[PDB]
Design a protein around this ligand. Sequence first.
Ligand SMILES: C[S@+](CC[C@H](N)C(=O)[O-])C[C@H]1O[C@@H](n2cnc3c(N)ncnc32)[C@H](O)[C@@H]1O
Length: 274
Amino acid sequence: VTLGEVWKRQLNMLGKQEFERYKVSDITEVDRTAARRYLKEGRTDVGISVSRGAAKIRWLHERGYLRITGRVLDLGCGRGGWSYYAAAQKEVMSVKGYTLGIEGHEKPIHMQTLGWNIVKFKDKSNVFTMPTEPSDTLLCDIGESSSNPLVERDRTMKVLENFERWKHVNTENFCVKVLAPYHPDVIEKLERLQLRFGGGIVRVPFSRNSTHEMYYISGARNNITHMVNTTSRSLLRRMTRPSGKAIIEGDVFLPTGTRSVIDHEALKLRVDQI
Ligand SMILES: C[S@+](CC[C@H](N)C(=O)[O-])C[C@H]1O[C@@H](n2cnc3c(N)ncnc32)[C@H](O)[C@@H]1O
């Protein structure tokens, strides 16, 4: 009944060729060719990003939707694309990434982009049930798509609920994936969070048109219903007139090395484990 649900229904009726043409229509895309070859080759001496997701947080950060600073927590870090990005940032002092890393889930990848020494990963960690800890910057990129819209609704709600559990008084900066933002319960939850914590919701152009995912962020205030509806209408318009062409931009390439705000023995042990 929402435009979002209409979008989702139509998406799953498209032919293969049509779905493929649609999913990239007028989106932005980083070229991952170089990073993929270095990952395959298993190099750790090159400043590449371990995932395509790093482009999302770079956009959010550079645009000013998110300040990344102090003690950064990254919930559902997977390979760690957001964790390594954060670690390379001037005002960041530490990064802690948590992820399941169970069968069929990505495990943290060892890399040596700038600030790798201030990043700690722990897999086999369920962020929904584990103890919380303070953060200045709280990131969560969780929300697994499903053909059942109600499963997506429930998954979105759980992510938002867990964000509120992890948020400390000093957590002034945040970025939380909202997988399916158009469900009335999700809109309501977002509005209730905003009443307490401010912020707003944004569509990242690096998201494919095959997902309606948006991000609840600390660095801008906006009207939740309007932004979500605006995105719904944009995904629908692109569906009526698919260009089949994405805007290609350069990938998240980073310098390498360690930061000052160094115990190489404990670092080696940390890398041995990853
Ligand atoms: C792959 S995306 C992370 C992408 C990441 N932002 C990047 O740039 O590399 C979501 C990750 O969250 C993890 N995840 C889902 N539910 C989780 C949970 N309850 N606790 C910890 N991690 C979870 C998934 O295993 C998945 O790897």
